[PDB]
Design a protein around this ligand. Structure first.
Ligand SMILES: [Mg+2]
Ligand SMILES: [Zn+2]
Ligand SMILES: [Zn+2]
Ligand SMILES: [Zn+2]
Lengths: 56, 266, 56, 45, 115, 86, 69, 147
């Protein structure tokens, strides 16, 4: 129960939640410091070579 | 000249009470918003602590020092440190004040803002001096020392606006009211038995005639004739708060006009 | 997280400050308020789970 | 050597890594490291 | 800590322009101007002045999020009247009104005695 | 192969399920990200998921769904022949 | 701990009135309401600034200094 | 302010409304592992100390302590300490005859920062040297604080 059915995971974040009347129903506001820690592995393709190069 | 009109009811070195007539509500609101948030002012921004044996913290004392009102009459002759060509600060964009206090006596010795000494070259300007606005001649009670305690620090004052930090605001509460008789029906008065008996009459009700007690609602009337009272912290004269608020607002509209012109060429 | 609406997929909006921000209408499915509640964020790591998350 | 201060008699001492941690005047066993003499900068906000 | 620096409210950043004018396709002769490093102070004043022009059919501004100091201004004028010219005229009207107000206050203040 | 039901007696729904659509879009999106040949014309699109959606709308995903039955038998359904109505 | 420099709500300077406030209370035998108005504090935002302040620095000053010069 | 949230005046915050001091103390002792192995408060060097932390030791003095009044931040070492090691143990290479010490320092909390407020050095009941370091920081209300 403590290590197989549930476990601690990577690529996650926790903080206090606030209410934003100016966000869409499906949007979530993410603090900038958290967005810099969490990453997404994006594969290099002809459609994203330039954008990924600038990010690097 | 036949535009917005002004009538001053009460003038002082700390408060100016006037009636702003023949104006729009948007203009009146922008005037008070600019007077609160966008009039440049001189205030202590960085503090170097050399000795601090007081019962207060350095950050505690620094916050207090930044809230002390300094003279800002010639603030326009000063520059923004961000817009100046100097490493850290110079005489063209800053004023330097030193505070040296020692507990030489057995009784508690009080450190006031009158003890701040300007050690920069003011270059004949009229900025930097702490504002003394009391009877005894002292200023703000900065700190208290007992025997053997010392406070040694150097303050650097820069110009800014209350949008960056409230310490650069030259204005205290601003009174702003229109239509004291509620003839435009912009408020729906909460009451229990009778709203007229339950809501005290504004002092400005004496400058306007009451409703004619039975005439139809005037749907063509727009808000004007605003009653405003501007208070000043003393950094700049209260009359200058109004004048420079108009100047700041006028410049902001001009900047939009200039930016529009710059886009036209390209 | 007593029911499946307590885990829902949102679109990221990177923002200033240190709190998560969400629309008011999604507070009832989460059984959440803004008196100090904290919520968890999980980032998918592949195109499979990334489309799965946004399509289900 | 570095300079310390007694916590009861406020006497300024100079101790080395070999000296015992104690006030040579009154005998207290708690010493306060003296404040650094390099200037520190603070924003007034 | 994620507190943005307070000078981001008024100081215009690098590669960022004060104005951004883009045509509006939802209606004819309509344009949307994005003001950077501004707030309700200019938006309310400019929008109110525009509404006094008889050749303006629509005028509205909004601050989409209070976190960022920018507001949008939508202007639609009558055919043959350029929305940029409408903004020019309104801005001139505000400047002239403010200039008159400053003179009126100064002449009235010089008549007082207590201060 | 007794567990492959012939196409003439398939008794499953002729409609794509939500889970089938989700995996097909994710499956093809992953392939596109790995430089897979796109069989639909792109009028300007860089997100693999959006390209997959365009392919699904135009029925150009060369995959089949092997629907399994609780007894081990299965049915093969092409993504092109499956109705996307949900 | 010590008197705030400014009123929190409106920013009027109130840190130069603490000693005047105490002197009015002690020697002039004025009630705190009259003293607050005599000092020019009209808005109740400013009145509570001086009326609810607790002077703890006086307590802290009773301890001998950590470092004497 | 919907659903139990509130709006605070930034101007009031600027003037000091609900602003507070935060103090944190760090404790460390000079342990004696019997009769042979002993620790000392020191500013370790990268040439004689192993497993030194990636932070900075620039603020320590020769006694392994930061003087009060110095500003500290994340990963900064505030109590420098070293202990001797036993030979014939090589990790990731990098263990040469030069190395005879290993870092046992105390770094500041990763998320916390501030100014060192007080450092006291004394001895425990057993006569071993141990120190306390206190760090000051100011907390200003923001969009996640509870009131
Ligand atoms: Mg709760
Ligand atoms: Zn300069
Ligand atoms: Zn002693
Ligand atoms: Zn007040």
């Amino acid at each position: 129960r403590g290590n197989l059915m549930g476990k601690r995971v990577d690529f996650s974040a926790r903080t206090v939640i606030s209410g934003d009347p100016n966000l869409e129903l499906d949007q979530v506001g993410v603090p900038k410091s958290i967005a810099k820690t969490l990453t997404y592995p994006e594969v290099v393709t002809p459609y994203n070579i330039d954008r990924l190069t600038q990010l690097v | 000249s036949e535009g917005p009109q002004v009538k001053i009811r009460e003038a002082s070195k700390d408060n100016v009470d006037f009636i702003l007539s023949n104006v729009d509500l948007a203009m009146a609101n922008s005037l008070r918003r600019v007077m609160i948030a966008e009039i440049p002012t001189l205030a202590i921004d960085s503090v170097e602590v050399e000795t601090n044996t007081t019962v207060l913290a350095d950050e505690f004392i620094a916050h207090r020092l930044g809230l002390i009102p300094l003279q800002s009459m010639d603030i326009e002759q000063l520059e923004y440190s961000r817009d100046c060509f100097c490493e850290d600060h110079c005489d063209k964009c800053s004023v330097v004040l030193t505070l040296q206090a020692f507990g030489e006596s057995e009784s508690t010795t009080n450190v006031y803002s009158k003890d701040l000494v300007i050690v920069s070259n003011l270059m004949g300007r009229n900025i930097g001096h702490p504002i003394i606005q009391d009877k005894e001649g002292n200023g703000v009670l900065i700190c208290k020392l007992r025997k053997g305690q010392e406070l040694k620090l150097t303050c650097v004052a820069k110009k800014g606006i209350a949008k960056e930090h409230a310490k650069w605001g030259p204005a205290a509460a601003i009174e702003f009211e229109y239509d004291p008789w509620n003839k435009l029906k912009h408020t729906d008065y909460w009451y229990e038995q009778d709203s007229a008996k339950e809501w005290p009459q504004s002092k400005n009700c004496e400058y306007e005639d009451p409703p004619n007690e039975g005439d139809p609602f005037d749907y063509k009337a727009q808000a004007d004739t605003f009653y405003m009272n501007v208070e000043s912290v003393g950094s700049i004269p209260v009359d200058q708060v109004v004048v420079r608020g108009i100047d700041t607002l006028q410049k902001k509209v001009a900047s939009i006009l200039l930016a529009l012109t710059q886009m036209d060429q390209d | 997280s007593l029911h499946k609406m307590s885990m829902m997929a949102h679109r990221v909006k990177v923002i200033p400050y240190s709190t998560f921000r969400l629309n008011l209408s999604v507070t009832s499915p989460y059984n959440a308020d803004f008196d100090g509640d904290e919520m968890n964020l999980h980032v998918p790591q592949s195109e499979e789970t990334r489309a799965e998350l946004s399509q289900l | 050597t570095l300079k310390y201060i007694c916590a009861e008699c406020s006497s300024k001492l100079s101790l080395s890594r070999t000296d015992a941690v104690r006030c040579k005047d009154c005998g207290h066993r708690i010493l306060l490291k003296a404040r650094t003499k390099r200037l520190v900068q603070f924003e007034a906000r | 800590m994620n507190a943005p620096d307070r000078f981001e409210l008024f100081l215009l950043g690098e590669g960022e322009s004060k104005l951004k004018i883009d045509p509006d396709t939802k209606a004819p002769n309509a344009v949307v101007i994005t003001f950077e490093k501004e707030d309700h102070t200019l938006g309310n004043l400019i929008r109110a002045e525009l509404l006094n022009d008889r050749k303006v059919l629509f005028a509205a501004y909004k601050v989409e999020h209070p976190f960022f100091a920018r507001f949008k201004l939508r202007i639609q004028t009558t055919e043959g009247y350029d929305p940029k010219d409408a903004l020019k005229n309104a801005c001139n009207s505000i400047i002239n009104k403010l200039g008159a107000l400053k003179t009126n206050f100064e002449t009235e203040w010089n008549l007082q005695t207590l201060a | 192969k007794e567990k492959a039901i012939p196409k003439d007696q398939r008794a499953t729904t002729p409609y794509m399920t939500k889970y089938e659509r989700a995996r097909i879009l994710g499956t093809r999106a992953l392939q596109i990200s790995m430089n897979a040949p796109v069989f639909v014309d792109l009028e300007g699109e860089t997100d693999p998921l959006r390209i997959a959606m365009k392919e699904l709308a135009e029925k150009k995903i060369p995959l089949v769904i092997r629907r399994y039955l609780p007894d081990g038998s299965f049915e093969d359904w092409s993504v092109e022949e499956l109705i996307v109505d949900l | 701990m010590i008197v705030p420099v400014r009123c929190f709500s409106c920013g009027k300077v109130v840190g130069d009135k603490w000693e005047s406030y105490l002197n009015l209370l002690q020697e002039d035998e004025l009630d705190e309401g009259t003293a607050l108005s005599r000092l020019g504090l009209k808005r109740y935002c400013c009145r509570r600034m001086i009326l609810t302040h607790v002077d703890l620095i006086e307590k802290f000053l009773r301890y001998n200094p950590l470092e004497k010069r | 302010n919907q659903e139990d949230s509130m709006i605070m005046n930034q101007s009031s915050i600027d003037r000091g409304l609900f602003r507070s001091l935060f103090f944190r103390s760090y404790m460390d002792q000079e342990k004696k592992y019997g009769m042979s192995i002993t620790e000392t408060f020191e500013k370790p060097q990268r040439t004689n100390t192993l497993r030194m932390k990636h932070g900075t030791y620039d603020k320590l003095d020769d006694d392994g302590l930061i003087a009060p009044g110095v500003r500290v931040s994340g990963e900064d070492v505030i109590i420098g300490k070293t202990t001797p090691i036993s030979p014939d143990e090589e990790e990731l290479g990098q263990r040469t005859a030069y190395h005879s010490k290993r870092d046992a320092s105390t770094p500041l909390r990763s998320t916390e920062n501030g100014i060192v407020d007080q450092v006291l050095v004394t001895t425990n009941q057993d006569g071993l040297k141990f120190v306390k370091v206190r760090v000051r920081t100011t907390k200003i209300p923001q969009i996640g604080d509870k009131f």
